[PDB]
Amino acid sequence: PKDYCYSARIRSTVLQGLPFGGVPTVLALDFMCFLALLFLFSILRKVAWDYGCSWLTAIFRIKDDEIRDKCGGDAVHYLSFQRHIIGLLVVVGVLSVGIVLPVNFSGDLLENNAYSFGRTTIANLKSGNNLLWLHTSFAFLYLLLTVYSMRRHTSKMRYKEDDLVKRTLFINGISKYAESEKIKKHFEEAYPNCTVLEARPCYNVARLMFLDAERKKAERGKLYFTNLQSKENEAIEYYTKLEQKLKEDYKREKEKVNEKPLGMAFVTFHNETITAIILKDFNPRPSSCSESLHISNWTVSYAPDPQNIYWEHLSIRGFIWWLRCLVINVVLFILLFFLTTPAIIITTMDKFNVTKPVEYLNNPIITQFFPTLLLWCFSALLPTIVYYSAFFEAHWTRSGENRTTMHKCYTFLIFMVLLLPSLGLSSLDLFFRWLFDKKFLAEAAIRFECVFLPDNGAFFVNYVIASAFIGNAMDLLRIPGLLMYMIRLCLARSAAERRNVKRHQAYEFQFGAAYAWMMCVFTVVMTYSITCPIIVPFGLMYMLLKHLVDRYNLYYAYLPAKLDKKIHSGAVNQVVAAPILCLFWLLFFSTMRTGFLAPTSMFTFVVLVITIVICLCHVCFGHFKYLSAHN
């Protein structure tokens, strides 16, 4: 009827957007780049045939037994994770395209434009429609399909925590000048059965291994330059002098490291049961040395592996560590904002100045391919920046450091591509509709019925696409061995020394980065599955390509990792978190379209309230009937 939704017969309503949302054009430019990036990997594969198109046949000519044997259980767990996500995405893609998309096409909100992409999006749905319940029901159902699927995935692993570690205790808050003997005697006195094997109070070690690592680097530099001089017949003098200064500083400090106690100690116990008794009582029993020790100010927890602990980063503790962490997070947040602004700005540079014709709509390359490529480049470079930031964070235990880097990279990535872009597009679409009354209109307010997105969600379809046919291809080119390109232009002869640079390799295939990036794209796909269902077909291709490229990378170009078990539990937590974001964004867009007074918004808010509260209490109660069922 008179759908009033940017009817082109009046003003031509430049806000419409490019026909077909510019999907096909980006489905070629990067796709051609796909059949250009793959081909290039070949040329580079010639580097492998310099003593240190067959990749296509080699990718498919592998089996599960060999990858299980060579790269261990971590790689096979990661591959099973990918396989289960691909299965879940197959189910949604069949389900969403099967049922959601024809429901979306039904109704007349953008049908007045034949080529408009919004017909497939949720924007085509009326203000009040009974079948819109499906939209706010299916998403809920998907959440179940995300719990069950990972339930089928989290029930295919073993212990990895045989002893579960109950030997030593990492205690913080001990009185600074307390000696080991006092705390030992206190431990004997406080508990009935106690045999303290060893109690070591940590000292401010930092400067010692700072200067020692500098000395070691100077030593290896001097040795390398002396070996080079011995062969070819001032680096040696400068390195020597640096070594002498570093050794002098090392002895000078070693004479004074002991005058810096941290008030933090490790205690070793003969039996595990006594450790269990001690931890419970602290989560205390007095002794003759209790008052002087300031026991009430202590913190007692399971001591991690000695190889797992950053000794040098132990000194930074208390409030100042938290302040430094917050400052680092804020600076990274600001950089995140300054990197995500250009994509939105370039995409919506056309849509400003509504008083313009449709023909002013730029080429789909300019508004929906270049912004997408820039966003993908920033998002792929983001893991490097976030990891690099972890060194300047003082996070103590390494196992905790990897977990927090994976989670932080996931959060920044999901802010880079989903949260900030979606909120920004909603903001500079509400501005547009609010600017869609002064030109030629008489209504006193926005009808709030076509306010979905400036391009009706086609931007994120282009983001998923350009992360499949370009992200995976560049992932395949991100093999340690890319440093085998610039060498070609650096000289024309001396073949021998180039391949020595190749011999470095030996990256452990940091799993958080792959997990975080996959979780980012999966979060985009699942959040926009219910409102822009055409995205799910393009997520299946992404996950299939990621699976194949990562299998090739693991079995041919990556060292075995042997990562902590907790990383995979974090990853399954993220997988469950994705449909939660989908439900939240469904609630947000239903609120914008109709508001809380609609029954659909009430339904989805009730579902979100139910899901969140039972997810929060999982960390405290857990029990059965919910996910993370590793056995």
Distance CA(267)–CA(270), nearest Å, equals: 10
- Of 287, 308, 329, the residue at which a domain comes to its end is 308
Q: Which two tokens stand for residue 59?
A: 């990718």
Q: Which residues pair with 302 in a beta bridge?
A: 169
Largest interatomic CA distance in the chain: 91
Sheet with 299-302, edge to edge strand ranges? 196-203, 261-269, 168-172, 299-302
Does any domain span residue 624? no
In DSSP notation, 315-369 reads: SS-THHHHHHHHHHHHHHHHHHHHHHHHHHHHHHTTTSSSSS-GGGS--HHHHHT
Task: Give me the phi and psi of 60, to 5 degrees please.
Answer: -85, -15
Same structural domain for residues 143 and 157? yes
Does any domain span residue 214? yes
Same structural domain for residues 448 and 530? yes
Distance CA(83)–CA(87), nearest Å, equals: 6
Distances, alpha carbon 167 to alpha carbons 192, 194, 426, in Å: 18, 13, 54
Q: Please choose, from the candidates 463, 376, 348, 367, the residue with its C-alpha nearest in 3D space to the C-alpha of residue 22.
A: 367
Distance CA(303)–CA(457), nearest Å, equals: 48
Q: At what angle do helices 511-527 and 398-414 cross, to 10 degrees?
A: 30
Q: Please choose, from the candidates 345, 379, 378, the residue with its C-alpha nearest in 3D space to the C-alpha of residue 521.
A: 379
Q: Please choose, from the candidates 552, 623, 581, the residue with its C-alpha nearest in 3D space to the C-alpha of residue 57.
A: 552
Q: Please state the domain count of the chain.
A: 2
Give me the residue label for tokens 């930092």.
206
Q: Please choose, from the candidates 414, 417, 410, the residue with its C-alpha nearest in 3D space to the C-alpha of residue 466.
A: 417
Same structural domain for residues 477 and 520? yes
Same structural domain for residues 20 and 150? yes
Same structural domain for residues 333 and 291? no
Please answer whether residues 406 and 570 qualify as being in contact, where contact means their C-beta atoms are separated by less than 8 angstroms.
yes
Same structural domain for residues 59 and 156? yes
Q: Report the SS3 class of residue 553.
A: helix
Please answer whether residues 572 and 93 qualify as being in contact, where contact means their C-beta atoms are separated by less than 8 angstroms.
no
Q: Which two tokens stand for residue 392?
A: 């300047």
Distance CA(500)–CA(484), nearest Å, equals: 10
Please answer whether residues 529 and 142 qualify as being in contact, where contact means their C-beta atoms are separated by less than 8 angstroms.
yes
Same structural domain for residues 294 and 438? no
Q: What is the dihedral of CA 469, 473, 474, 480, to 10 degrees?
A: 160
Distance CA(50)–CA(484), nearest Å, equals: 11
Same structural domain for residues 265 and 177? yes
Does any domain span residue 115? yes
- Of 308, 332, 354, the residue at which a domain comes to its end is 308
In DSSP notation, 577-627 reads: HHHHHHHHHHHHHHHHHT-TTSHHHHHHHHHHHHHHHHHHGGGTT--SSSS
Distance CA(472)–CA(35), nearest Å, equals: 12
Rg, the chain, Cα only: 29
Task: Give me the phi and psi of 171, to 5 degrees please.
Answer: -110, 130
Q: Please choose, from the candidates 459, 174, 223, 207, the residue with its C-alpha nearest in 3D space to the C-alpha of residue 313.
A: 207
In DSSP notation, 172-208 reads: E---TT--HHHHHHHHHHHSSS--EEEEEEEE--HHH
Distance CA(576)–CA(593), nearest Å, equals: 26
CA angle 202, 204, 209 (to 5 degrees): 105
Same structural domain for residues 413 and 325? yes
Does any domain span residue 5? no
Distances, alpha carbon 317 to alpha carbons 101, 314, 322, 323, in Å: 54, 7, 8, 10
Distance CA(306)–CA(291), nearest Å, equals: 30
Q: Report the SS3 class of residue 7.
A: coil
Distances, alpha carbon 191 to alpha carbons 34, 278, 280, 285, 303, in Å: 67, 8, 12, 7, 19
Task: Tell me, in Å, the resolution of the deposited structure.
Answer: 3.6
- Of 256, 287, 308, the residue at which a domain comes to its end is 308
In DSSP notation, 265-308 reads: EEEEES-HHHHHHHHHHH-----TTHHHHTGGG-EEEE---GGG
Does any domain span residue 343? yes
Distance CA(407)–CA(46), nearest Å, equals: 37
Distance CA(263)–CA(250), nearest Å, equals: 23
Same structural domain for residues 327 and 296? no
Please answer whether residues 166 and 272 qualify as being in contact, where contact means their C-beta atoms are separated by less than 8 angstroms.
yes
Domain of residue 374 covers 14-162+319-619
Q: Which two tokens stand for residue 562?
A: 């042997």
In this structure, the number of other CB atoms found within 10 A of the CB of residue 619 comes to 9
Distances, alpha carbon 294 to alpha carbons 180, 259, 298, 299, in Å: 14, 21, 7, 11
Does any domain span residue 484? yes
Does any domain span residue 3? no
Type of residue found at 6: Y
Please answer whether residues 463 and 539 qualify as being in contact, where contact means their C-beta atoms are separated by less than 8 angstroms.
no
Q: Please choose, from the candidates 553, 554, 361, 537, the residue with its C-alpha nearest in 3D space to the C-alpha of residue 461.
A: 537
Q: Which two tokens stand for residue 214?
A: 């500098």
Q: Which residues pair with 264 in a beta bridge?
A: 172, 202
Does any domain span residue 2? no
Give me the residue label for tokens 């391949």.
499
Please answer whether residues 541 and 531 qualify as being in contact, where contact means their C-beta atoms are separated by less than 8 angstroms.
no
Q: What is the dihedral of CA 232, 234, 238, 243, to 10 degrees?
A: 10
Distance CA(227)–CA(310), nearest Å, equals: 33
Helices vs strands, H then E, count in the chain: 23, 4
Please answer whether residues 131 and 102 qualify as being in contact, where contact means their C-beta atoms are separated by less than 8 angstroms.
no
Distance CA(267)–CA(170), nearest Å, equals: 7
Please answer whether residues 436 and 542 qualify as being in contact, where contact means their C-beta atoms are separated by less than 8 angstroms.
no
Same structural domain for residues 425 and 365? yes
Structure-solving method: cryo-EM
Same structural domain for residues 413 and 518? yes
Q: Report the SS3 class of residue 50.
A: coil
In this structure, the number of other CB atoms found within 10 A of the CB of residue 420 comes to 19
